[PDB]
Nucleic acid binder design. Sequence first.
RNA 1: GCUCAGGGAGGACAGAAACCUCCCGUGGAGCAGAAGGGCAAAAGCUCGCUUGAUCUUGAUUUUCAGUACGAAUACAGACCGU
RNA 2: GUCUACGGCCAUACCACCCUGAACGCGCCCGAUCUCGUCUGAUCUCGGAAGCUAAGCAGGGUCGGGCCUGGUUAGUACUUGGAUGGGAGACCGCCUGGGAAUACCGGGUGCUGUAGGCU
Lengths: 170, 293, 159
Amino acid sequence: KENPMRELRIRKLCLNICVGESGDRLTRAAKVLEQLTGQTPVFSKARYTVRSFGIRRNEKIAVHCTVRGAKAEEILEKGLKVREYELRKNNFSDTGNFGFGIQEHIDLGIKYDPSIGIYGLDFYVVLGRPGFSIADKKRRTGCIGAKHRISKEEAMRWFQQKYDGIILPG
Amino acid sequence: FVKVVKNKAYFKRYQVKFRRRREGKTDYYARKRLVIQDKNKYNTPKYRMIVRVTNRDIICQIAYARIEGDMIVCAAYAHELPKYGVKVGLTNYAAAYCTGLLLARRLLNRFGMDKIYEGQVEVTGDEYNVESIDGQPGAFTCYLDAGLARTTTGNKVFGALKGAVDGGLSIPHSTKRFPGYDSESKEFNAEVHRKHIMGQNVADYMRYLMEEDEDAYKKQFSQYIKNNVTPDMMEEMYKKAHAAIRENPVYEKKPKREVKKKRWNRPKMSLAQKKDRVAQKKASFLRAQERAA
Amino acid sequence: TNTKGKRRGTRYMFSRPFRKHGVVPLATYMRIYKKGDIVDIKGMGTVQKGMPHKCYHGKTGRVYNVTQHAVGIVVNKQVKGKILAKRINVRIEHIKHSKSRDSFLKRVKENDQKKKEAKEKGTWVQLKRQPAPPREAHFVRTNGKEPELLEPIPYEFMA
RNA sequence: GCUCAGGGAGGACAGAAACCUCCCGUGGAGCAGAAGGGCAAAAGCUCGCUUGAUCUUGAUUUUCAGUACGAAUACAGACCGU
RNA sequence: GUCUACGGCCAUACCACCCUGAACGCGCCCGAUCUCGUCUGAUCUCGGAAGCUAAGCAGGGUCGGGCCUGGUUAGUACUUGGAUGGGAGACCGCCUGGGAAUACCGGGUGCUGUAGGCU
């Protein structure tokens, strides 16, 4: 029927917000991802200068926040109230990692603070199976087989069957 | 389409790395600094102490390198502490110290250096170093191979260095990694280093769990309840295991068991038989084609 | 006039072979050079410490000194008329032992042993060598069947 | 301690190009500068600490008269770094 | 037979899929009170022994790609030495010796120390 060692858990929940300003607009993008989670996020930096947007060399842009484990189903289930339990047939990649986002933050459960504000966000869950671990350790690393790799056909049926959701072409 | 990367070309020009890198074990950079000898000493072999800490256990060999390939003068492992009154505690900082002291007292058992160089009987827990006397045979002066073990102030590989020096070896070492050393205040603590060697750091987690609730006491210290290892006989027991190493160090093996003579693994299919496999596949595709049409 | 410039016209001399870059294999490091031993020289690009000049590449010469990382070695080398023999220091990677200096140390074992053994019975054991002597008569037996008539072949164009 | 030139399939405004991920990748990048060699748990990216870029008598290689300078190789004795 | 620790030679050992694992190894794994490090016990350090050969690893498999070693190409291209050889030149004949590389057709697909086991 099935072996117990293939249990396709959740590994991580990447969360970030992109703004394009250096001052008080960037610090208020780390306060929105700290009232939900409970761990301070790090500010990133750039690659090069294209003035049409305007972000100079090493001028700060985005802010990210990974959390795993027990806090990989409490935040992700809030975001599916805002996405109404559905995706499109062009949101899945060809490993098997599903991508979505929302327009604003207040209906996730966080209360509006007058000075901090509202900021849109950019979800990304990363599926897995006990033994993708292997390919990261220092000591005796390997790859991860082919019967153990996830596909675009084992991220679909995992979503629609358990949560009673729906997925549509186009 | 995209270009294909790995095409005929790609392989033609490939250089595979050494074997032991592909597998991923040996680090050559350090090896080369480690293993070899300065020409004006000729043969006069260089000596090391290998240590490795496997999932369930620990291993402690000693070696010098020949061209045909390095040689293990002496090995005392951590699967033999079943024979020194140690029912559990075989992966841990405390059982890195016994497998380091087994190696030293077994190597000093093998060349006539039993009475010379005793090291330490009382576990104090501080910086120690071995001298050389007049009119006697001298001390051992090997080094530490650490493998790929991130070397941080608290790590069992260092538990195995300190096991061998207190047996009676003159290895160069430092207390900036031995547990207890306050990296903030910059002084070396004596009796926080001693708490980790005897095994009272594992004793705290029996009384902390059982006083809180009886849930996480079960999966954790399960083979401790199974063999009858209470917190009372924690330091009563690890003073017994450092006397049998001193009293009876020499190694004792099993006899080579009689062979049934049977085949488990598969033998390589033959030139003839591989040819036997390509006149039946070719032919039976073409009979079933006339069968289908 | 060409340039002076120590590594000039070494474009392919100090290179590596195809599918042989990378790490120095470890046996190279661990073979004891003694004093006296005969040795042959060949620069290596991998290690830019310790090279010989491009002229001694190819040659051969005995050792006179041993230390931590090198050996001191005596070679010959021409110059206009005369032969200056001279002392050049080189790191170990750009060196092997010399290999026609041990076909002599195993025929000397064969030559010493057969003039003490084979004497007490009574036979003279010729240890000196002679270059290929001129062959002597032999029969060539046909076996019913015979040789072949090789007529040569007439021309044809082939383009 | 960490791995790039570049490529593909994903994600709120975001687009050819802002930033986040997973997979493929013998170096197609990089190492101040002409050009050739040389290097991937690095000689390359990032932190940590520092100043052997300190004082001193000889041997040798290179250009060669087998003289000078310049620059280079292989040791010995200080005190130092990590 | 087979595997562990440390290796020498560095693709006959690499790469892509697929069929087999019995005992002991080695691993996925479950923890975060202390030692140690992370935006995140994921990695790094630390304690353990509820779960399973799904994977890393091993053996085998494939008119498989490469890699290694033979046969054709071929005594064909090149060549040291030579004669008051041919020819308007270009260049090409014979004399005496040294002798290359594809395409195309075969077969092979890791050996092997020093030290602990298991069947």
